[PDB]
Symmetry: D2
Subunit: 385 residues, 4 copies
């Protein structure tokens, strides 16, 4: 029942199941994991792949020999399991050098270092088979209003992403970029704080088609926004290159709960959308097994992620398949919503008297939308009633 | 001291000082105002202009004779005072017909009615002298996940804005459109919920250059976002067509407090940005005099709005002019932030050994950003210390 | 399946299913309801009772003859259906006189009027059979810091509740009082903003035992707080006199969605607590059928409320009954949590070397809490997997 | 100008200026500080005292010899400067043993260890001169609903605080306890999440008079609550034993910005209240110098804290002293708010016809509260206009 299989495209970061449990107020509650053990245990669970930061795989400051050896080990384990690496990313946030940002650090040399550090890991991402390269600008921001001229910072952010797009263009790489937005934490306000701000930013890049969004459930909910709506707008724009799934209990610190926790109904509507829309990219879980757990709880957490996706997937499909739902959708005119407002054209619209001078504004006002009956049907399918 | 004058470009909606005090839990605490009296009292205060919804000026359902008479009165008062009308908008939210939206109402005929209702008021806006026409889609949204297919809704939203852009193009009008984003209320989630989502949406329109944003202080703060940063990104994109100023005490219902209340420091940084960047559009106050006030408190509220702008304007200018601030900005490398990261080009960057192999990551990590001293200087100027 | 019956104790306010749909931005989308029709339609649905404000039943300003007639009608309908009135309340918020508060209005005569208005409705509540009288101080608060001396306001709030407690004591009434807390809206900050603040306030009253809390799901979630935890603390203190059930999607305006919407998991844990703890008071639904609905949607909304309670009640019971859950609870030491920490006494504790000098802090640190497996079991039962 | 002196009662934790800069996503950006250096540098700045956790002063796991030596050093430095230690606290949150709580850890032996660890530091706090002992239950809580039976947890919390109260009673100590509330982080929901919940909890303790609250600016604002109002309610209840001052930009992770940042107006009203009410306890700053700073920025941060208090103190005093403010307060009837509502008694109230039957509800409704003019006066004094 609800057993995950690699065709489900479930992926996990090395940093997720390998989180040692240090939080702002606490020390690690778990010993570090061998990336190789993660690969094999995740493959046993039914995962489709893993993702990594450069420094999850290669300890910061490794000479090429060590680095090569760390990669050969990781490469070996993927070979033995058939595990994919669909996405990679750079750690531009842990090391104190990045304390004011990577690509938008006030210090010019830190910015050039961040780009060299990322270019090095793009080569490795592509060699390992990554379709998407993620930019999380967790340190691009400020705690106070004078510390960052945001228009200059967006110049530097644009300049960095333009250079990376020129790099993958000159190398011949197929990889595309996804910005992962976050409204705040660890900076007091982070640049490109929501899906929307990142989508707007991409349109100003030099090669907009190389760039998409990698939205995370909990980051949009940290702004109180509706994650299914924002995903729908990324899909609408054609930019849902990737997605991070997890749970969040509203506006507060980034919890990275497992997927299905936090906002259960929004997780349902998310799965309904991803499946209805035919999203075919990774179902990536960017979660943190709570530091209250041992390693047995870490893997139970990872399995819950996939399991909750598959239950929601089952309930959303039965919702859409249900003829009572089909009838309720028509009673609430979701059909009419897909009809062009004025395919007859502006001039036709302007001369239509039934659209204004002779519009029965009160007969129209009196037609109930029947949204409650529809929603209680969605509730019944979610709960299995 | 801090007396407002029409060159300051301070404008007010008819619905602001004319709010009668009905809230979700309460009846009106003030009698309705004559638009004409508003015009004259605001001109006495030092306002530069007024804005209106169609139904603030012409009672809904007025035959052309009444409508013409209401406009002749309003036209007369503007003539007598020299008051400008820089912006207008349509009321697509009060009347029960709009209970599921205007441009994205599930009901097709309501959508066509909303467009005819807006086209009629565009003609009036232009005749009265409006540079900007604002779309607030307060009813475009949902309370539940199945009630609205967001990708279809954005099709209809795009189709409506494309038709309005075709309308003003065929008439020869100079007017441009500004979306006013709002994350929620009166709908549980509103489409295009932030500056960012609206900027992304505009890039998909057919004539993107006709459309900008009209951001409101309190709406971005209802998502917990940094209003100065989002304004900086609108400015960066070249889309700050208009702006709504007011106060908001964080994430909660839309308060529409007067400007300067709510987040005092963010109001300071906002004014610093608008003035540094050279924004030359209206300083529009979309506030609500609390229903605790009489009409004497209504005008004191309107005056406070302008007064708090002018005090902040004075403090932000002295901040920038202060050589100690100038030195602190250089100590925090805001200068370096304006320097191209790699004007030498990708290949130069790639072969720079001082940007990676020979980067002293620890000397760079050890340089303090000096943001605290900078911010305490901004605090001292704000408070006049 | 999940059909509600009067033994379930489901009650509804006259103002819930009778909400006409006016919100801050919109006009009514439904005609007013006859209280008598509400009584009969709710009884048909399976409700146990109704609640009312004075002005939901008697139009404000009714001479005694009309008032008597409105009560005789309502009394008649209850007789015909067997509908209970377990709780009543006073409207101290709609009328403009209450614009700065009722019991804490700065104006002394408004305060005395509020008490007379409430005393009049206490007599009616008791005659109709009310066990609980609710105080919602929606207008007790401020939009700005100088407008209200909060220590003086709490003096007046205490003085009002002390007088009402002296009133019901002298009349011989069995009725008890419940404060319904709300953090904000319609005032910018409301006094006694959470369950906790109200519980603290009651301890300073003269007859603390006459007063409890009437918490609402959405009001605590408007502060981002955990409604099951706060209910647990009310229960712990012995003060859960009543409860308002509904849905809320986080920190934003008060939505009054139907129960089960908003935070689905928190609704589950709430029902688990109310049923485990043996709460035997009303399951009162203080919700608002969205103004998008017609009267058919209003009753479907009311039925959904009761239905979602009964599904959650079924899932929470199967969770507790499940031996796998029982074993998981013991693995996570919920049993140990119910054990006195030091029933052996302070001196025994102080001389226990195994509690400090010889405590294996690292064997204890290494025992995983097994909370993930427990929570995935709760998820499986909720979803029916 | 605004130079702090020890009579101002400004205190700082060892953990504040000694924060090394590790956050959930980052490594330390500063080397550790010698407690002794902190004492001397803070005394040079004008501080009145320092506070500590046990493990800020004595490295966890120190034999008595080391421990004694660490205390002799710290004792020496206080002697040389005259620095007070008004408050101490226990670290029950860093070490992995406390991962599920201290006093409410599901594991009974961890609970007994937490009490022994705290009792040991109470002896040291008193010897060093502490008036207040603070309990921050940062690990008392849950991430999921089944992991903690909140009623049992409050039994254990009550049992622990009852034992500590029995301990200081038997030793003859003058010290009193203050709970520092926090709504969330590092746990998903923390028990006793607000000032109110903690005040309610104290009333159920065995010796309620030994216990007060230690509220923090940022923790109540993380729930979106009004920190001046909650402080007013602590003062009203007679429980403001201590207070933590800092800045917070709304609902998001705990920022611990320096005091005066975050919500500038609320900081003003806070100082106005503390000074008007005559609070005479420590002005304790529980802030974190951002990890972007070097040690020079750390001390500039600490100085800004005290400086912003003294500027606000100056502006609030001039506000209250201003006869125009005095007149505006009377126009808004803050005077009437301090008048007993019904000192004439219930029966007098009940027979007053001018309080109901003959109340001019509409003349009263028509009197404007004049809150806007009052608030703009408070704004003018704050900004120095
Ligand atoms: Mn995250
Ligand atoms: Mn607004
Ligand atoms: Mn409510
Ligand atoms: Mn804090």
């Amino acid at each position: 029942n609800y057993q995950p299989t690699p065709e489900d495209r479930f992926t996990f970061g090395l940093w997720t199941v390998g989180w040692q449990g240090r939080d702002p107020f606490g020390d690690a509650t778990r010993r570090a994991l061998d990336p190789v053990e993660s690969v094999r245990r995740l493959a046993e669970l039914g995962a489709h792949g893993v993702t990594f930061h450069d420094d999850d795989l290669i300890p910061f400051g490794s000479s090429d020999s060590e680095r090569e050896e760390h990669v050969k080990r990781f490469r070996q384990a993927l070979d033995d399991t058939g595990m994919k690496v669909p996405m990679a990313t750079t750690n531009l946030f842990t090391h104190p050098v990045f304390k004011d940002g990577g690509f938008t650090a006030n210090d010019r040399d830190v910015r050039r270092y961040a780009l060299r550090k990322t270019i090095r890991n793009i080569d490795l991402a592509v060699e390992l088979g990554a379709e998407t390269y993620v930019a999380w600008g967790g340190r691009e921001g400020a705690e106070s209003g004078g510390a960052k001229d945001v228009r200059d910072a967006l110049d530097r952010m644009k300049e960095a992403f333009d250079l990376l797009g020129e790099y993958v263009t000159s190398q011949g790489y197929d990889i595309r970029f996804a910005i992962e937005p976050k409204p705040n934490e660890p900076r007091g306000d982070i640049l490109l704080p929501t899906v929307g701000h990142a989508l707007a930013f991409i349109e100003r890049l030099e090669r907009p088609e190389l760039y998409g969004v990698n939205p995370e459930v909990g980051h949009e909910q940290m702004a109180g926004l509706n994650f299914p709506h924002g995903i729908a707008q990324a899909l609408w724009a054609g930019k849902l290159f990737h997605i991070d799934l997890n749970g969040q209990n509203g506006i507060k610190y980034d919890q990275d709960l497992r997927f299905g926790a936090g906002d259960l109904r929004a997780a349902f509507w998310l799965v309904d959308l991803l499946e209805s829309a035919g999203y075919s990219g990774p179902r990536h879980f960017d979660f943190k097994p709570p530091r209250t757990e041992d390693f047995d709880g870490v893997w139970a957490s990872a399995a819950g992620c996939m399991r909750n996706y598959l239950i929601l997937k089952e309930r959303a499909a039965a919702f859409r398949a249900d003829p009572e739902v089909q009838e309720a959708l028509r009673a609430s005119r979701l059909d009419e919503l897909a009809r062009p407002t004025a395919a007859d054209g502006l001039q036709a619209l302007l001369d239509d008297r039934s659209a204004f001078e002779e519009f029965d504004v009160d007969a129209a006002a009196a037609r109930g939308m029947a949204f409650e009956r529809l929603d209680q049907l969605a509730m019944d399918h979610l709960l299995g009633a």
